[PDB]
Design a protein around this ligand. Structure first.
Ligand code: PC1
Ligand code: PC1
Ligand code: PEE
Lengths: 248, 84
C-alpha cells in the first residue's frame, strides 16, 4: 500500500508514456466486416452432443479470489475481484447523485444518466453503441440519490474495449446540442418505469415526505415541464465540472 | 486508449470492399435462374432458326420428319418437296 484514502490503503499506479503503435498490438482482436472467408465444413456435424469431443484440456488453475485495491495518480480508485468467471462486470461509480442538486438544478443528475454513452471526443454516439452491441455487451447508466453508476457486462477478453468506453463518459463527453435534445424523450420513459413498480414508487414518496425539500428528498427523476429549460449540454457540463472528478 | 480508438476507427476502413462482396453474394444467388431463362428463350425462338440448326440444337431429336402432318406451310408438309 502506497496511499491511504478515506481509511483504505491503495497501491499507487504510475502513469507511463507508451507509443500508440506498441499498445495497438495488445488490443483484443475482433472484426466488424467479414469480406470473404475460408470455407470449412462443420467437423462435428455428425457427432451427437452426448459424445465428448475435446481432448488434452490444460489442467485448471484455481486461485482463491481476493479483492485488490489500487489508485491512479489522478485519484481514481480501482477495486477488482477475480472469481475466474468468464463474464466481467465493469462499473464506474461517481459520487454525484440527486442529493447534491440545488433547487435551480433540479433533475440534472437524471439528465446526466440520460446522455450516457453519447458522443465523446474520440467516438461518435453510433460507433459507441454499435461496438457495445457487436461485442455482445449489455449495460447502461443509473443515477441514484448519492451516486451515478455506469456498468457493462461482457466477455472478459474484451475488457480493454469496455473500460475505454465507460471512462469516455466522464473523461471527455461531447454534450452536443442536438444529441442532448434527443434525450428529452427518456424523461417520460423514466417516469413510466418508476410508477410501474408500485413498491419503488411508494419508496420515492416516502423519501420526498421524510426529507422535505432537502438532500435525500430531492426527486430522483427530472420533470418534463420547467426542468427542460436547463436540459442542455452547457448546463450538464457545468454540473459535471462541479461534482464529477477522479477523486469522487 | 488511443490504440483502442484506432482499432474502432479502422474496423470499417474497407467499406467499399465489403459492400461489393454483399452485392456479389446477391448476384451469386441469382445465377440459378439461368437454368429456366435460357431454355425458355430458345423455346420461344425455336421457329426462328433454320432447320439444320433446329436439328443440331435438339441433338437430332427434331428433324424435318418431325414436322406436323399438316405443316403451317401446306406445300411443305412431308418435306420441302411435298410427300411425293
Ligand atoms: C467433356 C465433355 C465435352 C462435352 C462437349 C463435347 C462433346 C459432346 C458430345 C459429342 C458431340 C460433340 C459436338 C458435335 C456438334 C455437331 C453439330 C453440327 O455439326 O450440327 C450440324 C449443324 C448443321 O451443319 P450442316 O448444315 O453442315 O449439316 C450437318 C450435316 N448432316 C446434315 C449430315 C448432319 O451445324 C451446327 O449446328 C454447328 C454448330 C456448332 C456450334 C459450336 C459452338 C461452340 C461454342 C460457342 C460458344 C459461344 C459463347 C461464347 C462465350 C464467350 C465468353 C463469355
Ligand atoms: C473429353 C472427352 C469427351 C467425350 C467422351 C466420350 C463419350 C461421348 C462421345 C460422343 C461422340 C460421338 C457422337 C456421335 C454423333 C453422331 C451424330 C450423327 O451421326 O448424327 C446424324 C444425324 C442425322 O443426319 P442426317 O440429317 O443426314 O439424317 C440422315 C437421315 N436418313 C438416314 C434417314 C437419310 O445428324 C444430326 O442429327 C445432326 C446433329 C447431330 C447431333 C448433335 C451432335 C452429336 C451429339 C452426340 C450425343 C451423344 C449422346 C448419346 C446419344 C444421344 C441421343 C439419343
Ligand atoms: C418483361 C417484358 C417482356 C416482353 C416480352 C415481349 C414478347 C416476346 C414474344 C416472343 C416471341 C418469340 C419469337 C417468335 C418467333 C416465331 C417463329 C416462327 O413461328 O417462325 C415463323 C416463320 C418461320 O419461317 P420459316 O420458313 O421456317 O423460315 C424462318 C427462318 N428459319 O418466320 C420466322 O421464323 C421469322 C422469325 C423472326 C424472329 C426474329 C427474332 C429477333 C427479334 C429481335 C427482337 C429484339 C427485341 C429488343 C427489345 C428491347 C426493349 C428495350
Amino acid at each position: 500500500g502506497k496511499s491511504t484514502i478515506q481509511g483504505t490503503s491503495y497501491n499507487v499506479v504510475k502513469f507511463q508514456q507508451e507509443d500508440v503503435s506498441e499498445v495497438v498490438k495488445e488490443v483484443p482482436h475482433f472484426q466488424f466486416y467479414y469480406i470473404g472467408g475460408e470455407h470449412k465444413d462443420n467437423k462435428y456435424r455428425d457427432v451427437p452432443l452426448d459424445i465428448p469431443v475435446l481432448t488434452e484440456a490444460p489442467p485448471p488453475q484455481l486461485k482463491k479470489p481476493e479483492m485488490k485495491f489500487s489508485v491512479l495518480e489522478n485519484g481514481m480508485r480501482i477495486v477488482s475481484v477475480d472469481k475466474q468467471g468468464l463474464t466481467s462486470n465493469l462499473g464506474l461509480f461517481v459520487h454525484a447523485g440527486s442529493r447534491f442538486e440545488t433547487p435551480a438544478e433540479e433533475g440534472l443528475s437524471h439528465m446526466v444518466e440520460c446522455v450516457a454513452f453519447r458522443s465523446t471526443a474520440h467516438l461518435s454516439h453510433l460507433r459507441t453503441i454499435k461496438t457495445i452491441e457487436v461485442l455482445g455487451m449489455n449495460g447502461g447508466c443509473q443515477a441514484g440519490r448519492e451516486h451515478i453508476m455506469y456498468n457493462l457486462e461482457l466477455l472478459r477478453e474484451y475488457m480493454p474495449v469496455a473500460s475505454t468506453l465507460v471512462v469516455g463518459n466522464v473523461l471527455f463527453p461531447r454534450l452536443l446540442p442536438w444529441e442532448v435534445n434527443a434525450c428529452h424523450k427518456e424523461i417520460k420513459k423514466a417516469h413510466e418505469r418508476l410508477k410501474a413498480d408500485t413498491d419503488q414508487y411508494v419508496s420515492e414518496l416516502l423519501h420526498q415526505t421524510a426529507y422535505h425539500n432537502n438532500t435525500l428528498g430531492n426527486a430522483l427523476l427530472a420533470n418534463e415541464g420547467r426542468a427542460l429549460e436547463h436540459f442542455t449540454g452547457d448546463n450538464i457540463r457545468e454540473f459535471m465540472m462541479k461534482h464529477f472528478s477522479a477523486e469522487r | 486508449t488511443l490504440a483502442v480508438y484506432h482499432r474502432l476507427w479502422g474496423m470499417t476502413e474497407q467499406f467499399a470492399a465489403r459492400k461489393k462482396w454483399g452485392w456479389r453474394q446477391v448476384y451469386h444467388r441469382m445465377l440459378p435462374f439461368q437454368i429456366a431463362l435460357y431454355p425458355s428463350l430458345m423455346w420461344y425462338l425455336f421457329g426462328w432458326f433454320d432447320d439444320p440448326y433446329k436439328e443440331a440444337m435438339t441433338l437430332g431429336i427434331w428433324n424435318v420428319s418431325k414436322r406436323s402432318l399438316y405443316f403451317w406451310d401446306p406445300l411443305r408438309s412431308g418435306g420441302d418437296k411435298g410427300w411425293y
